[PDB]
Design a protein around this ligand. Structure first.
Ligand code: MG
Ligand code: MG
Ligand code: MG
Ligand code: MG
Ligand code: MG
Ligand code: MG
Ligand code: MG
Ligand code: MG
Ligand code: MG
Ligand code: MG
Ligand code: MG
Ligand code: MG
Ligand code: MG
Ligand code: MG
Ligand code: MG
Ligand code: MG
Ligand code: MG
Ligand code: MG
Ligand code: MG
Ligand code: MG
Ligand code: MG
Ligand code: MG
Ligand code: MG
Ligand code: MG
Ligand code: MG
Ligand code: MG
Ligand code: MG
Ligand code: MG
Ligand code: MG
Ligand code: MG
Ligand code: MG
Ligand code: MG
Ligand code: MG
Ligand code: MG
Ligand code: MG
Ligand code: MG
Ligand code: MG
Ligand code: MG
Ligand code: MG
Ligand code: MG
Ligand code: MG
Ligand code: MG
Ligand code: MG
Ligand code: MG
Ligand code: MG
Ligand code: MG
Ligand code: MG
Ligand code: MG
Ligand code: MG
Ligand code: MG
Ligand code: MG
Ligand code: MG
Ligand code: MG
Ligand code: MG
Ligand code: MG
Ligand code: MG
Ligand code: ZN
Lengths: 83, 155, 9, 60, 23, 97, 61, 206, 127
RNA sequence: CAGGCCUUGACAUGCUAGGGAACCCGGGUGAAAGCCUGGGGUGCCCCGCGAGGGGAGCCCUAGCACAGGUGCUGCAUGGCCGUCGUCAGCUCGUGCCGUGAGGUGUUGGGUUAAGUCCCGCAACGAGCGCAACCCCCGCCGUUAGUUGCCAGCGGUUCGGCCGGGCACUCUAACGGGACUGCCCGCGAAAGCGGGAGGAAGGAGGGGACGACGUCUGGUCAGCAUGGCCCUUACGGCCUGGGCGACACACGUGCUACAAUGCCCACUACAAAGCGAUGCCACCCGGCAACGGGGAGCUAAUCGCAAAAAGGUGGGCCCAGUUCGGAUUGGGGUCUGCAACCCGACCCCAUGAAGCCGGAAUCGCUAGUAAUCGCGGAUCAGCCAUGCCGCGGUGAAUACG
């Protein structure tokens, strides 16, 4: 994974929206195309609409999913099996 | 091999006994170009074969080769679309080759853990007329004796 | 015969 | 998607990763030699033509 | 064998170094 | 007076090596003969066809030959004469001390 | 170190929470599919299991 | 679909490069692009003068550009007017010392790129392709050459079925290295598409 | 004071200096049996003198570089066999009949495009 | 593919028109693109003390002409490639035969790798092919002696290190060399067998080289190009997704199933290449990936670099193992704006199938196969076990 000598990477333009919410008394639906953003404790409690190539997928953020990335919870392929 | 028949490669005689037949036998031991390892296996067994059964190593080797040379074998011929088992006399070139080949293979079928011991015991058992390589020779000689009815198809 | 644009296939 | 893509390649990109080689002559994005700035096809055409200094068919 | 990164032969095979093939 | 010259065509390279070595053999003193350095070869292997046919190739090499000549005792008569010398375009020269 | 059954507990516990949150890895532990980004068009037989052959597409006589 | 290019086969032996200079891996591409960019402009303009070759030589911030040609007229111009008007535009892209020269072509009918261009031009005018070929070969042999062969390939006469037709005289040994064989290609555009003309002129063995 | 031969075989080049002595050989600044320790084929480089009985009459100062320890051996075998005929031209006969005077041109064949090696081909399968 | 945008357009020439811009830094919104915007302020030549007004690189916007399309047709094409096939062939000119298609030559005997030559003949010649000229390898010479070499003297921190030298090894240019030229025998000859000499012998080994043509073979997606189609869209920019999906089936491969093996430590011998936002010695932190220092080299100099198999010593003892290294948990490193999808690498743990493979099927005739490692192109990194090269060790077999 990313070198921790670098930062825990967030596109800033999303972290911007998160912090203004905490100040103003959230919630609000958050539409982002930044799957590459890392989930961060300031996101706990919200729901974020993560784009998967076709749709913005809501993702309620919980404590146990804090260390992961945003795209992990907006799956990108529909499959539902064969036969 | 349509045009001319091939020439038989002459081998550099070995740096111990000065014997081509020894060099040929080591080449049948060799796998993946490791002639060093190969020659090392063959000589270590010569030690073993002088310890056990105090005969001369080179003398045991050659006699084991003699006891494994087959004098007759079956081949295939035509006469129509038929596939006969024809008994043929084995050429000296081929007697040596089959004898050497069956020895390594019989040796490696043995149950002794390390390679030189398998070759030591097989060369010992062969020089006394036992061993898988001798059982393979007699087996070949039998199949040419049975199909002696079709011997009149030989060339 | 060969997908490419509209024709797709 | 060709001429707009052969032009976008010359442009300076928002990041130094999005820069990719591109045949100066025909525009191939693939099999592009840094040395000649050509692609494997144009390289062959100019070599047979003698318009590449010193280059020649190798044989050994 | 060559497929096991955790041995010298593996490090040689992938052309890498580590505790199991250092410099 | 350390003079190294390079080129793709060696016939033009060895020619200009013989010229300069004889420029100091006229005025000057000791020449260190035109010693050939190992040729550095950059090869190019290409799929001979414009499409699909991978098992048919064509090889091209680009040879950069290297020659070295050393003038022992300069004598600025030589350092002058060298300025006037017919150096073909296929050759590029470099001089150090 | 934690060993034997105690270790297998945390390995289980991590896989389970990967499935609970519903991340992309947890989806692949659900379906027993390769998790570290491998091909599934072929191979994957260690993770997917023995082959389950199916009838295929046919030609014309 | 098999034969190798006759020039590139003989480079360094019977044929020499059309760009003679050295460079290093730092600016080789930049200079070679300049040659091509320069040679692009020349073949575009000097076509009407029958451009048979462009030689390039280099030292540093200067360039040769020796243009061989059948008619030096359209090159030089009035007292050296076009030769200036182009040399001006020339270094306007080179930014260097561009010293254009003009060499005359001894026999134009002994030059392969010219024979191909005369046939390519003749068939754009809707001339009898089969005849234009035999004549061209006939001219090259009348010009003393030891052999000639000419290939036109495509929709001859505008037929729907494409075709290849050729003629030859004397001898043209493409497998022979010591045989000086000038090769040249010209492409003829028509109402119905592209034809392709290959000219082979066998000068002699050296 | 010396007798020299140049022995080459397969990218390996040998410089053999035969000086009269006890039969003591060194190769690249160390002893023969130190530089060929464990290579049964080693005893083959000193085979030419066996044909002229010069076994312990010559010491040898030998250097070799390039190739591999067995290709270096065959170079030595040619090198000393090249120095002996310089020392004694009469050594021509009995050496040439034993083939010690020649170098084999047998070198590695180049890999070719469309193969795995020089001749090993990629596996064929119609359909 | 989805969604947010652009409409003379990302790009070419040409025409006007308004602004009258040149260029470089900002701002708001937005995922970005985009849309909206603000500052630093035009050289030609000029009427110039005047206010300055125009003309023009080039820009911006408006409007045309046109651009753009990896949309279709490889059954309209060029070019290039595959293929039969490195197979010995395919032809032409005149003459002769035949009403004619066509035949003859090119068939026949002998010979050869070869329509390669010899002999014969209503044929006599000639062309494309074959061979040869070209390149690498094998021996020898010559010319060269640094960054390469060290034979012999002299020093020698003991390293070709300094003196000295180019002998040698080498490196790289030019030559020599093989011609069935000589002997024996067969033969009508060409040739064939054998022998001598020679580094090399019957084309020395490998390469480059591919006849008229065939497959209406491949490629309109490298490029070119006729024709057809799209024109606020089948064109253009962007963010994200997909190209990496997975009940399955096939090809080409890597690693293995072990003791001629696996592991650890020590110790040897290559070749070809590559290397100034490059290779990076050496030193320190770290198990390590790597990080930080930090020389040298535009490189026969300095670096990649350790070659590996091998040699020596030591361990494992026939086990699904000290065989095998898949899968998975956790912890890190590096590139990159960014490694969720979907990177490589390191460390701890995990330690699957697999006991040599059914019907069937592939490669290779010698420095080959097998095996062992090394480099390069592409390239930020890399899914390379692929490709093109390089050497190390080095077989078996051909009756037919
Ligand atoms: Mg588009
Ligand atoms: Mg285009
Ligand atoms: Mg890139
Ligand atoms: Mg590229
Ligand atoms: Mg293991
Ligand atoms: Mg490396
Ligand atoms: Mg392939
Ligand atoms: Mg080919
Ligand atoms: Mg992954
Ligand atoms: Mg991965
Ligand atoms: Mg993977
Ligand atoms: Mg996948
Ligand atoms: Mg029309
Ligand atoms: Mg060499
Ligand atoms: Mg090899
Ligand atoms: Mg390999
Ligand atoms: Mg076609
Ligand atoms: Mg075509
Ligand atoms: Mg059609
Ligand atoms: Mg042939
Ligand atoms: Mg045929
Ligand atoms: Mg036929
Ligand atoms: Mg006639
Ligand atoms: Mg008649
Ligand atoms: Mg009649
Ligand atoms: Mg006829
Ligand atoms: Mg005849
Ligand atoms: Mg015929
Ligand atoms: Mg005929
Ligand atoms: Mg006939
Ligand atoms: Mg002929
Ligand atoms: Mg010399
Ligand atoms: Mg040829
Ligand atoms: Mg078709
Ligand atoms: Mg098709
Ligand atoms: Mg088209
Ligand atoms: Mg196109
Ligand atoms: Mg993607
Ligand atoms: Mg793909
Ligand atoms: Mg593979
Ligand atoms: Mg397989
Ligand atoms: Mg590289
Ligand atoms: Mg070892
Ligand atoms: Mg187990
Ligand atoms: Mg099992
Ligand atoms: Mg184990
Ligand atoms: Mg993990
Ligand atoms: Mg990824
Ligand atoms: Mg077992
Ligand atoms: Mg098997
Ligand atoms: Mg095995
Ligand atoms: Mg063969
Ligand atoms: Mg192995
Ligand atoms: Mg990379
Ligand atoms: Mg790379
Ligand atoms: Mg590699
Ligand atoms: Zn190109």
């Amino acid at each position: 994974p990313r070198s921790l000598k670098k930062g825990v990477f967030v596109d800033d333009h999303l972290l911007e929206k998160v912090l203004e919410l905490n100040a103003k008394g959230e919630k609000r639906l958050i539409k982002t195309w930044s799957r590459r953003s890392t989930i961060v404790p300031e996101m706990v409690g919200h729901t974020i609409a993560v784009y998967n190539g076709k749709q913005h997928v809501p993702v309620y953020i919980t404590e146990n999913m804090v260390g992961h990335k945003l795209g992990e919870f907006a799956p990108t392929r529909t499959y539902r099996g064969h036969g | 091999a349509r045009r001319r028949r091939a020439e038989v490669r002459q081998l550099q005689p070995d740096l111990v006994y000065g014997d081509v037949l020894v060099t040929a036998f080591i080449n049948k031991i060799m796998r993946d170009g490791k002639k060093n390892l190969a020659a090392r296996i063959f000589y270590d067994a010569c030690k073993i074969i002088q310890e056990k059964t105090g005969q001369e190593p080179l003398k045991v080797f050659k006699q084991a080769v003699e006891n494994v040379k087959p004098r007759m074998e079956v081949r295939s011929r035509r006469v129509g679309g038929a596939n006969y088992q024809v008994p043929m006399e084995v050429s000296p070139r081929r007697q040596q080759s089959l004898a050497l080949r069956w020895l390594v293979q019989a040796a490696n079928q043995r149950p002794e853990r390390r390679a030189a011991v398998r070759i030591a015991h097989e060369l010992m058992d062969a020089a006394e007329g036992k061993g898988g390589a001798v059982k393979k020779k007699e087996d070949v000689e039998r199949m040419a004796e049975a199909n002696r009815a079709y011997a009149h198809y030989r060339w | 015969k060969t997908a490419g644009x509209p024709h797709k296939r | 998607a060709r001429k707009a893509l052969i032009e976008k390649a010359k442009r300076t990109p928002k990041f130094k990763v999005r820069a990719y080689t591109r045949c100066v002559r025909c525009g191939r994005a693939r099999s592009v030699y840094r040395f000649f700035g050509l692609c494997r096809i144009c390289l062959r055409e100019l070599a047979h033509k003698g318009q590449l200094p010193g280059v020649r068919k190798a044989s050994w | 064998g060559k497929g096991d990164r955790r041995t010298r032969r593996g490090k040689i095979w992938r052309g890498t170094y580590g505790k199991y093939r250092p410099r | 007076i350390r003079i190294k010259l390079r080129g793709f065509d060696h016939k033009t390279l060895d020619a200009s090596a013989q010229k300069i070595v004889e420029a100091a053999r006229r005025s000057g003193a000791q020449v260190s003969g035109p010693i050939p350095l190992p040729t550095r070869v950059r090869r190019f292997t290409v799929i001979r066809g414009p499409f699909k046919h991978k098992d048919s190739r064509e090889h091209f090499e680009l040879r950069t030959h290297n020659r070295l000549v050393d003038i022992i005792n300069p004598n600025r008569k030589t350092i002058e004469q060298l300025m006037t010398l017919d150096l073909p375009t296929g050759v590029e020269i470099e001089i150090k001390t | 170190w934690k060993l034997e059954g105690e270790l297998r507990a945390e390995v289980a516990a991590n896989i389970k929470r990967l499935m609970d949150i519903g991340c992309y890895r947890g989806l692949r532990h659900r379906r027993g599919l390769p998790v570290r980004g491998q091909r599934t068009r072929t191979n994957a037989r260690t993770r997917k299991g023995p082959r389950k052959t199916v009838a295929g597409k046919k030609k014309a006589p | 679909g098999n034969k190798i290019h006759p020039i590139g086969f003989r480079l360094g032996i019977t044929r020499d490069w059309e760009s003679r200079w050295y460079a290093g891996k730092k600016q080789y591409r930049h200079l070679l692009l300049e040659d091509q960019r320069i040679r692009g402009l020349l073949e575009k303009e000097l076509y009407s003068a029958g451009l048979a070759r462009v030689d390039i030589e280099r030292a540093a911030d200067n360039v040769a550009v020796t243009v061989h040609v059948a008619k030096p007229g359209v090159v030089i111009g009035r007292g050296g007017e076009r030769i200036r008007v182009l040399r001006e535009e020339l270094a306007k892209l080179t930014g260097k010392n561009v010293a254009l020269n003009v060499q005359e072509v001894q026999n134009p009918n002994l030059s392969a790129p010219l024979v191909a261009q005369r046939v390519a031009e003749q068939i754009e005018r809707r001339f009898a392709v089969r005849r234009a070929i035999k004549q061209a070969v006939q001219r090259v042999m009348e010009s003393g050459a030891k052999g000639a062969k000419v290939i036109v390939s495509g929709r001859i006469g505008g037929a729907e079925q494409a075709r290849t037709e050729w003629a030859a005289q004397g001898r043209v040994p493409l497998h022979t290295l010591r045989a000086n064989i000038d090769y040249g290609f010209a492409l003829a555009r028509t109402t119905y598409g592209v034809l392709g003309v290959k000219a082979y002129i066998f000068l002699g063995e050296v | 004071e010396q007798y020299y031969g140049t022995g080459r075989r397969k990218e390996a080049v040998a410089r053999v200096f035969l000086r009269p002595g006890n039969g003591k050989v060194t190769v690249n600044g160390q002893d023969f049996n130190e530089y060929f320790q464990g290579l049964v084929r080693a005893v083959a480089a000193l085979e030419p003198l066996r044909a002229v009985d010069a076994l312990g009459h010559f010491d040898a100062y030998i250097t070799v570089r390039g190739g591999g320890k067995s290709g270096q051996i065959d170079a030595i075998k040619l090198g000393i066999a090249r120095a002996l005929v310089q020392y004694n031209p009469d050594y021509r006969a009995k050496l040439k009949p034993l083939g010690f005077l020649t170098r084999d041109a047998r070198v590695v064949e180049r890999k070719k495009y469309g193969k795995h090696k020089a001749r090993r081909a990629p596996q064929y399968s119609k359909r």
